[PDB]
Amino acid sequence: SPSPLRIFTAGGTIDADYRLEENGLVVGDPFVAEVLKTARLAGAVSIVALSRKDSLDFTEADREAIGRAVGQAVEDHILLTHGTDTMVETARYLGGLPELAGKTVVLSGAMVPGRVGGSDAAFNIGFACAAALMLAPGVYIAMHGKVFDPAKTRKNRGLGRFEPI
Amino acid sequence: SMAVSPSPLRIFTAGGTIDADYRLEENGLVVGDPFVAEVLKTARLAGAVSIVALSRKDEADREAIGRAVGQAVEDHILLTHGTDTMVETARYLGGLPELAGKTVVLSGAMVPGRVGGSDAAFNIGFACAAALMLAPGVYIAMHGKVFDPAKTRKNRGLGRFEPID
Amino acid sequence: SPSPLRIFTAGGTIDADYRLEENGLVVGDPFVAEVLKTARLAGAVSIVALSRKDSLDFTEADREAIGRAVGQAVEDHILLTHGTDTMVETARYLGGLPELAGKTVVLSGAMVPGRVGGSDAAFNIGFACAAALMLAPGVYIAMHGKVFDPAKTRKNRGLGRFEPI
Amino acid sequence: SMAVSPSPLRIFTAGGTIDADYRLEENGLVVGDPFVAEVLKTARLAGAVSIVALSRKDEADREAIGRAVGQAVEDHILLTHGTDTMVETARYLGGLPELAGKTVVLSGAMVPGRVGGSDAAFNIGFACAAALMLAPGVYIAMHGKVFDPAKTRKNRGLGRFEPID
Ligand SMILES: [Cl-]
């Protein structure tokens, strides 16, 4: 084989792990690395850690630093693992950067942490890696076994899924 | 009308390592229930996927598969299958004119989904996205990449598909 | 086979599970039921749900209701799954009830939720079930592969383990 | 002096279903690395457990086991073992005067620890507690209960130990 894929990690629920000192979940090590370790990949794939800050908390400065970091990648196929609560805002922001116009940028994450039983994370990672390799240049959210247009997408808290507007 | 999520993908299960499970009576692995059903149960799909059983066995068998695939209404098809004869099945489906408008992807796992350290969940997400996003044809989706069956072979001892140059 | 064992659940970390609506862990269904489902038990074992309230929050009234509930059991072998933060206080309280003097009462739980990867919970449950069947009448904490005397025990936050005083 | 946690228990591994793992080359399960080591890695033990390898094979073999067990300094011994011949091993150890002061418990799993839905973690906790708490002798600890080897048999098709009345 495939075109080279670069993966950026911005934390979120997918990466949550339990810590005794917190008596609860923190943003841990990136779960995408745990999934790809056993995927027996053939192709060129490399992972870059960007942030473990609470995704809810992302400022314009955080989003800007992500856009610049993704621009540092010569790869044209990009996966960004991310919190779901501000995924639409990040995706809309990246969609407005002319610097990224030639890249396929896919955001994904998980509704349940990878390190918790019953997680969507491994499926989402496989689906998003294929989406990043296969879709035309642009910025997408890959969740729920489908591809969302960030400009026409919202997270619906009642449904527990992204939906079209 | 209120939005209706489509179910554009149909999955057929032909068994294979991906579906292996432990049985006390055999004191070993048999082909068990389809593991792709377990992955999709927790994938929080926006739509749904019709999963249909074709075989749990380890020329006529390939013909029954072509018939089931060719009869499907869906234009996006995933067949979970053993890796030992996946190339043979894929090459046979490749020659059926009935499939000309369909994206047909074969996949599976080198490690059973029910065994620790399995590629299965990743493979299922990657293959579902491949079946949705690739142009019509017949493909093997494994190792985070897409293989042309006519130009692919299985290496038994390394648990990998590899090109024929 | 063994003498009949009664298991009471008072929640705690062992039982934590992820909820989308909380965006984090809540006290969920009792994890001991998930472990015993695959233990292939021979003996008489039954589970009773007592509480899912935060164990940190337990009042004297909560502890008293637990002591009375355990007294309702005709079984002489008792496992109580519980939060670690107030486990010593509950165990010291039960140790002072003449009503329970003829019973073996073991408290246990987990430093990491059963539903999180890398959990001590399944081992703790097996070890505590044996302790409840095998120890002389009295009240114990079974954690870390050993038996603690509640009167001479504390949880050491720095160590992440119970230790003797 | 500052408290020193003892390591009163030694574990010997003779293989068996508990340790089975998937190998691509065999296209099936072999006896792999000892699963009891994986369980104890996350058990947050106050002490430690010396784990020693005796066999990974499927009269002389039983003699080597008696020798290793009889040479141990520890008075509390757990032997992880296949369930098919556990009774034979246990009966043989039962007749060795060298073991008269030792609590020796055999255990294992009807489902491999590396397969979903395994009894192994529970069995290991239950058996470690049995090895610490039972009076000297030789025992089989399975199904959440203690068996007298002289009066026990393995039922192959049900994956259970059962009494001889
Ligand atoms: Cl939490």
How is chain A split into domains, by residue range? 5-164
Q: Can you tell me which residue has the tokens 């230790």?
A: C163
Burial category of A162 from C-beta neighbours within 10 Å (exposed 0-12, middle 13-18, buried 19 and up): buried
Best residue of C3, C32, C40 to probe chain D, by most D CBs closer than 10 Å = C40
Cα–Cα distance between A88 and A150 in angstroms, integer?
6
Q: What stretches of A10-152 adopt beta strand conformation (E)? A: 16-19, 24-27, 45-49, 77-81, 104-108, 138-143, 146-148
Residue A19 to residue A55: CA distance in whole angstroms: 19
Partnered with residue B162 across adjacent β-strands are B153
> What's the rounded Cα separation, in Å, for the pair A128 and B144?
11
Asked if B55 and B137 count as a contact pair (C-beta separation under 8 A), the reply is no
Query: Token digits for A147?
Result: 């591809």
Q: What is the DSSP letter of D132?
A: H
Domain A5-164 part of CATH 1.10.530.10: no
Across-strand partners of B145? B142
Residues A8 and A46: beta-carbon distance below 8 Å: no
CA angle C75, C82, A26 (to 5 degrees): 155
Q: How many other β-carbons are positioned within 10 Å of the β-carbon of residue B29?
A: 22
Q: Which residues contact D97 (CB under 8 A, 6 or more apart)?
A: none
Q: From chain A, pick out residues whose CB is under 8 angstroms from the CB of B43.
A: 120, 123-124, 144-145
CB contact under 8 A, B40 and A123: yes
Q: Pick left, alpha or beta for residue C21 (phi over 0 → left; psi -120 to 50 → alpha; otherwise beta).
A: alpha
**Residues from chain C contacting residue D40 (CB–CB below 8 Å):** 123, 145
Q: How far apart are CA C6 and CA C123, in angstroms?
A: 18
- Residue A20 · residue C119 · CB < 8 Å: no
- For A71, the enclosing helix (H) or strand (E) is helix A60-72
Contact C106, C140 (CB under 8 A): yes
Cβ–Cβ < 8 Å for B112, B20: yes
Of B100, B114, B102, B109, the C-alpha closest to B127 is: B109
- How many whole angstroms from A110 Cα to the centroid of ligand 1? 15
Tell me the backbone φ, ψ of residue A143, rounded to 5 degrees.
-150, 150
Contact D89, D108 (CB under 8 A): no
Task: Please tell me the CATH code under which domain D9-158 is placed.
Answer: 3.40.50.1170
CA D154 and chain centroid, separation: 15
Return the amino acid letter for A86. Answer: T
If residue C79 lies in a helix (H) or strand (E), which one and from where to where?
A: strand C77-81
Contact A39, A79 (CB under 8 A): no
Closest by alpha carbon to D68, among D82, D85, D50, D88? D50
Active site positions of B, annotated? 17
Strand ordering across the sheet containing B145-147: B50-53, B9-13, B76-80, B103-107, B137-142, B145-147
Look at domain C5-151 and name its CATH class.
alpha beta
Tokens of A125: 């990672």
Residue C53 to chain A, least CA–CA distance (Å): 15
Residues D80 and D142: beta-carbon distance below 8 Å? no
DSSP assignment of chain B, as one string?
A: --------EEEEE---GGGEEEETTTTEEEE-S-HHHHHHHTS--SS--EEEE------HHHHHHHHHHHH-S-SEEEEE--SSSHHHHHHHHHT-GGGTT-EEEEE--SS-TTBTT-SHHHHHHHHHHHHHHSPSEEEEEETTEEE-GGGEEEETTTTEEEE--
- Residue A58 CA to ligand 1 centre (angstroms): 19
The neighbouring-strand residues paired with A11 are none
3-state class (DSSP) for residue D33 = coil
Supply the DSSP symbol for D156.
T
8 Å CB contact between C81 and C114: no
Longest dimension (CA), chain D: 55
Residue that the structure tokens 């377990």 belong to: B38
Q: List residues of chain B with CB under 8 Å from any CB of chain D.
A: 17, 20-22, 24-25, 27-29, 84, 110-112, 114-117, 156-159
Interface test with B, best of D115, D118, D143 (most B CBs within 10 A): D115
- What does CATH list as the number for B13-143? 3.40.50.1170
Amino acid at A135: L
B103-118 b/e (C-beta count within 10 Å ≥ 16 → b): bbbbbbbbbbbbbbeb
Which token pair is C32? 């001991």
Gyration radius of chain B's alpha carbons: 15
Nearest partner of B141 among B155, B165, B125, judged by Cα: B125
| Amino acid at site C69 | A
Q: What are the phi and psi torsion angles at C13 (to 5°)?
A: -45, -45
Structural contact between residues C54 and D127, judged by C-beta atoms closer than 8 angstroms:
no
The C-alpha atoms of residue B84 and residue B94 are separated, in whole angstroms, by 18
Q: Are residues C42 and D160, on separate chains, in Cβ contact within 8 Å?
A: yes
Tokens of D93: 């150890």
Alpha-carbon gap, residue B127 to D73, rounded angstroms: 55
Sign of CA dihedral B12, B19, A118, A40: negative
Token digits for B39? 């992955």
Cβ-based neighbour number of residue B73 at 10 Å: 8
Q: What backbone phi and psi angles, to 5 degrees, belong to B49?
A: -130, 125
Residue A116 DSSP label:
B
**For B9, what's the count of Cα atoms within 13 Å in the CB-facing half-sphere?**
26
Q: How many residues are given for chain C?
A: 165
**CA neighbor of D66 nearest in space, from D102, D38, D30, D113:** D102
C interface toward A at CB cutoff 8 Å?
Answer: 13, 16-18, 20-21, 23-25, 85, 111-113, 115-118, 157, 160
Nearest to C139 by CA among C92, C98, C75, C69: C92
What residues contact D60, with CB distance under 8 A and at least 6 apart? none
* Residues in a beta bridge with A25: A18
- Terminal-to-terminal C-alpha distance of chain C: 37
Residue with tokens 């039972």, as numbered in its chain? D134
Which residues 6+ apart lie within 8 Å of A61 measured at CB? none
Please state, in angstroms and rounded to a whole number, the distance separating the CA atoms of residues A24 and A18: 5
- What's the full length of chain B, in residues? 165
Tokens encoding C132: 């409840």
Determine which helix (DSSP H) or strand (DSSP E) holds C134, and give its type and residue range: helix C121-134
Strands (E), D39-149: 50-53, 76-80, 103-107, 137-142, 145-147
The answer to whether B81 and B108 have CB atoms below 8 angstroms apart is: yes
Structure tokens at C77: 């072998």
Contact A113, A119 (CB under 8 A): yes
Q: Which of D56, D127, D62 is nearest to D88 (CA)?
A: D62
What type of residue sits at position D77?
I
Contact at CB, C17 and A85, closer than 8 angstroms: no
Q: Are C106 and C88 in contact (CB under 8 A)?
A: no
* d(CA A144, ligand 1 centre) in Å: 23
Residue written as tokens 């001991």?
Answer: C32
CA of A23 to the centre of ligand 1 (A): 7
A-interface mutation test, from C19, C20, C26, most A Cβ less than 10 A away? C20
Resolution in A: 1.7
In terms of phi and psi (left: phi > 0; alpha: psi -120 to 50; beta: otherwise), the region of C11 is left
> Is-contact D155 C72, C-beta < 8 A?
no
